[PDB]
Amino acid sequence: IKSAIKRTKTNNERRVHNATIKSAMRTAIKQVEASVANNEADKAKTALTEAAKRIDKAVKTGLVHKNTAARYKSRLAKKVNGL
Amino acid sequence: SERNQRKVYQGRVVSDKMDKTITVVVETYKKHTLYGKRVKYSKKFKAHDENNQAKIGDIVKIMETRPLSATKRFRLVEVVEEAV
Amino acid sequence: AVKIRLKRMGAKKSPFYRIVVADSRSPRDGRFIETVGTYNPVAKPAEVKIDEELALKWLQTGAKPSDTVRNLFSSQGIMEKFHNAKQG
RNA sequence: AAGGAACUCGGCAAAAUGACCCCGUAACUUCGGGAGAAGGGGUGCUCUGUUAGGGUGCAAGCCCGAGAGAGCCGCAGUGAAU
RNA sequence: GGAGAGUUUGAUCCUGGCUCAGGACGAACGCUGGCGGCGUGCCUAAUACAUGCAAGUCGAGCGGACAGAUGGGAGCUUGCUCCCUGAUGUUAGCGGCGGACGGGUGAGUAACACGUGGGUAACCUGCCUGUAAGACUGGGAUAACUCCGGGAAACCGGGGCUAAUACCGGAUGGUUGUUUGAACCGCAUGGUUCAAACAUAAAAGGUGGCUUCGGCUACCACUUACAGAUGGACCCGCGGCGCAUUAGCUAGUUGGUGAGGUAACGGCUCACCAAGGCGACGAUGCGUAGCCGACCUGAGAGGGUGAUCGGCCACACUGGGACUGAGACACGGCCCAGACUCCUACGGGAGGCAGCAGUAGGGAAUCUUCCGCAAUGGACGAAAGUCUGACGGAGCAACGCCGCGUGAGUGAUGAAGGUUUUCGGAUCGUAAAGCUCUGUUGUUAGGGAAGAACAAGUGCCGUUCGAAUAGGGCGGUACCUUGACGGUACCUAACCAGAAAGCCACGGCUAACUACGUGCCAGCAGCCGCGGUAAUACGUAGGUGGCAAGCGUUGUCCGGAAUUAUUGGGCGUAAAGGGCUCGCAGGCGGUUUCUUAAGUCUGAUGUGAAAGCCCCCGGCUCAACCGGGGAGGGUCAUUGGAAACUGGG
RNA sequence: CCGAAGGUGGGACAGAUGAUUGGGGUGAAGUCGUAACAAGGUAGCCGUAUCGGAAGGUGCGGCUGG
C-alpha cells in the first residue's frame, strides 16, 4: 500500500540472488569436506582456495559477516591441514 | 592501563557430583528495609573445577567469568581451607 | 548520527530551547547524551547561553549541528574556534 | 454398497480386540488393588555387523541379538493360524 | 513537625470496634455557571472500524518518455499545421537511501522485564567525524519501452531491446584464515604489538570550471583498515507481590567430550556418557501485575498509585515463519494458518486505526472527520526544495490549578416589603433608593509585537586544495528574504452599574435559628439517632454560617487509627501463654587479651539522566507556570583510614 | 527434519447451574417448656460418652470463674 511494493519486489530479487551466492558458498565448503573425507591433497587445496574465494566474495557483497566467515574458513583450514 | 576487575567471592562447596564443577554457598548477609535487623541468606553458585580438585565442605574463592554453560558463570581461584 | 540540536522546553505560547547533544534517532524532547546551555528566542533582545568548551568537545568527535544551532555557535563564535582548530 | 442396534424380551448370535516391546493410566480403595484401567506408538526385509553386549571354548568356530542409522518394497509387515 | 469527637452504663473507668471532622483525583453525578493563563481530557472492550490523511525522497546514479522552442525550413485560406535538439519544466521504471526513527497501546510478561551497580580477554554498530592507503581492466543480463498470450479483476507469462553509482568476472591490497618466529602482559579460557609466506577480499562514478583533448582539479559519492562517537547485544550482585486450604518440582532438565549454530558465550541446537539440578532462605503451581523517575497522603516511618511528562520493555486482528537491510524476525513490509469484513464473471482476490481526527459498541464517564510545516526536530537531496496527523497551533469540556470579576465611596426615611414579636419593637440594614464616581471586565473603533535564528542567493576578507588569480570547500562579516496561529496576546480612545452567584448547612461533633405545616405519616441520617399535636434534626419561609464560579453528593486512596504498634500496642480477670516435654534448623552469647576487618563509622572517586519535590534568583501585569543556579536521595561500585562494639581466628 | 493450527484421548483446575437437602442470620406481642443469671429453686462450666420434642438430663474426670 504505502509504496513498499518496490521494496517487496527488490526484496524478492535480492532474495533470489543472495540465495544463489549462499548456495554456491555452501557447495564449495561441502566440496572441501568431501575432499577431506576422501583423503586427497591437491584437489582439497584447490577446493579450499575455491571455498575461501566463495566465502570472502559472499562477505564482500552481503550478509555472511567476517566473524562467521572466519568460523567457516578456520574450520576448513584446520580440516585440510589436519591431513 | 590495567583492565577492569571481575567480581570475586569466597564460599563453601555443597556438591562435587557434577562433572568438573561444584556449587558454592556464599553466606554474605544483610539487613531489612523495615525492621533493620541483619538476617542471613545463602547463595549457591555454579563454579568450574577444571582439575576437579575440590571436596564438600571446602572454603574456596571463585572468580566470575563468561557463562561457561547453563547456570555456570564462575571458576576457581584459590582453594583456601580443606574439609576435615 | 550525533547531532547538537535544540530541545524544546517551556510553556505553551512561550518556547525555550536547551541546546542538547542528541541523536537523530531519539525524540526531540526525549533522551539525550549531554547538554550545553540554552536558547531564549522569546526575549525581545538576544540571550543565548552556550557552554563553549564542551560544545567544542562534541564538535570534534563528530557531531554536526542543525542550522539554527550552527548559527548560534557562530553568534557565540565556536565555529571560528573549530575552524582555527582545523587550520591547526 | 449406504446405514449402522433402527432388530430385539434382551447386542442372543455374529462382528470387533486378541502376540511381543515401549509410553501412559482415573474414580474409589480394606492400601494390596482397580490394572493387561483406559488411550497411544513400533514391529517386515537389506546393508552398516560373525556388532554393542553376553554363553561355551585355550583359541578357532558355534548359539543368543538390545539398540541405532541409513535405505528398499507392498493396500497391508504379530502380512497365515490362534 | 504530631489537636480529636460521638457511641457499650442507672452512673463510671478501662479494653474494643464502628462513625465523623482533612487532603487528593485522567474522576463521574446533581444544582449552578463570567472571562483569561497554564495543564489535562476512553481508567471501560488489547471491542469492531466507513472516510481522510499518518513515509517518502534524490534527474548532480541510470535508460526511456512527455512537453517546449533558440535558431532551420515547410504548405496554403491569414485561420493556421510541422520537424530539426536550445535552455527549460514533468517523472510510470531501474537504482540508492529511508521505511527498524518518529507517533499509539499496556493485552502479555513475576524474570535480568525494570531500577541500581558492575563485568564482556565473548560481542555487533549504517549514517557522522579524524587519519592512512586507494580507486585499475573487462564482461554479461534485466525493468522501462514495445509485440504477442492469458486473466472478472488482482495481475501474470512468452519472445524482442537497453543503461547505470545495478549485478558479475579480473588485476592490485597492511582485512580475514592458515603456518612458522619473536617481544611484552594477564583473570582460567587468554591479551596486545612486530615480521614472513600461503589463500582470497576491494572500489563507481556524477556535477561545475579550467584546457594543448592525453588529461588536471574541487565538491559529493565509492573501497579497505584504525580510532572516536553513537546506537545495539549478552551476562552477573542487589531490589521492588499475594496465596502453603500450592510441598515436592525438573529430564535438554543438571554437568562432561565432540560437532553444528550465533555478531558473540552458552543445552542455544544434536550425538555419546554421567545422575545430576531447585527446594521451607519457599522450588513448583495458581492469582494478580508493564517496571521506574515520579504522584497522592502522612510529623515521619510508611501506605496507596504507575494518568499526563521522561527512560527501558513488550505488543501491532491471533499463532508461526523467514526475507531484505548496518540494525527487524518489521504498527501503516512479506509468506502461511484461523476468525471476521468486502469484492467476484465462482476460478480467485483485497483488508487490518492499540498512528492523528472521527464512527459504532461497552460504560457513571472522557473531545475536532481543523489550520501549518512559520518555528524545533526527523528522512532524502549537492542544494533549492519535497514529505512529516511528530511537532507548532486551533476547536470542544469548570475536567483541574491559578488569577480578575458580578461594582465602589457616602448614605437613617432604619423607606416599601418579607420574617418574627411578650405587639414597645427586633431584624433583613447603609444593605436599597439619594448624592458622587471608576471601567478590569462588556461593547464599539483604531494602532500593533517578541515567537525570525535562518536556509538558499549574492558581494567581500582570511585560509586549504589546485597546474593555476579557474572553481569549490571551511570560518567571519555585509545585504536581501521567510508567520498557520493572526490583526491573536497587547496598547489606546468612547459609553452605561449597565451583561454577570450560586451551592450546601444551621441538635452535638461542627461555624450557623427562629417561625408555619406535618404528626412514628411524609420523611432525614455519616454517627449519636430525629419525627407518635407545642419538631432549632422532617418540608417551606426568613435568617445565619461556610465557601465561592464554584458548591454538594458519590466512588477509591492515605491520614485520623498508637487500629498490624520498626518508630509505636499487647496475653492473671477485657481478644491473646502452645497441655507439657526432648530437641534439629534458626536466633541470642560470661570474662581478659592479641589479631582480622565481613557488619559499623569516616574520606576520596564515579554514578543515582532531563523534568518533579526543596533552596536561591529571574521573566511572564501577579499567580499558576516558565526559566536559570544549586541541593537532596544507594545496605550502590572502586578505593583509603579507625578498631570501641557485633562477627572471624 | 523442525513446525503453527487442527484432530483424537485421558486427567487437573475454575465459574455457573441442579430435583432435593443441612446448618446459619433476620423478622409482625405465634406454640411448647424454663436450661442459665440469686443457693436461679438439682451450684454452674470444661472435655468426653450416652439418651431425650426442645432447652437439656445423666455418667466419668477436672475447675471456681461457689
UniProtKB/Swiss-Prot annotation, chain A:
Q: Which residues cross the membrane?
A: none
Q: Name one GO cellular component term.
A: cytosol
Drop me one GO molecular function for this one.
structural constituent of ribosome
- Tell me the keywords, alphabetical order: Ribonucleoprotein, Ribosomal protein, RNA-binding, rRNA-binding
Mention one GO biological process in which this protein takes part, according to its record: translation
The answer to whether UniProt assigns keyword Secreted to this entry is no
Record flagged with keyword GTP-binding = no
Q: Which Pfam families match?
A: Ribosomal_S20p
Concerning InterPro entries, the annotation shows: Ribosomal_bS20, Ribosomal_bS20_sf
**Gene3D superfamilies, alphabetized:** Ribosomal protein S20 (1.20.58.110)
Q: What is known about its subunit structure?
A: Part of the 30S ribosomal subunit.
This molecule's function is given as: Binds directly to 16S ribosomal RNA.
Family according to the record: Belongs to the bacterial ribosomal protein bS20 family.
- What's the protein here called? Small ribosomal subunit protein bS20
Report the source organism: Bacillus subtilis (strain 168)
Its encoding gene is what? rpsT
From Swiss-Prot, chain B:
Role played? One of the primary rRNA binding proteins, it binds specifically to the 5'-end of 16S ribosomal RNA.
Gene source species: Bacillus subtilis (strain 168)
The protein's UniProt keywords, in alphabetical order, are: Ribonucleoprotein, Ribosomal protein, RNA-binding, rRNA-binding
The UniProt entry's GO CC annotations, sorted and at most eight, read: cytosolic small ribosomal subunit
Disulfide cross-links: none
Q: Which GO terms describe its biological process?
A: translation
State the family it belongs to. Answer: Belongs to the universal ribosomal protein uS17 family.
Q: How does it assemble?
A: Part of the 30S ribosomal subunit.
Supply the gene name.
rpsQ
The GO molecular function terms of this record are:
rRNA binding; structural constituent of ribosome
User: One Pfam family name from the record?
Assistant: Ribosomal_S17
Cross-referenced InterPro entries, in alphabetical order?
Answer: NA-bd_OB-fold, Ribosomal_uS17, Ribosomal_uS17_bact/chlr, Ribosomal_uS17_CS
| Name under which the protein is recorded | Small ribosomal subunit protein uS17
UniProtKB/Swiss-Prot annotation, chain C:
Alphabetical UniProt keywords: Ribonucleoprotein, Ribosomal protein
Molecular function GO terms recorded: structural constituent of ribosome
The record ties this protein, via Gene3D superfamilies, to: 3.30.1320.10
Q: May I have one GO cellular component term?
A: small ribosomal subunit
Biological process (GO) annotations held by this record are: translation
Question: Which segment of the chain is annotated as a signal peptide?
Answer: none
Under InterPro entries, the record lists:
Ribosomal_bS16, Ribosomal_bS16_CS, Ribosomal_bS16_dom_sf
Q: Which HAMAP family match?
A: Ribosomal_bS16 (MF_00385)
Q: Quaternary structure?
A: Part of the 30S ribosomal subunit.
NCBIfam families listed in its UniProt record: S16
Q: What is this protein called?
A: Small ribosomal subunit protein bS16
What species is given as this protein's source? Bacillus subtilis (strain 168)
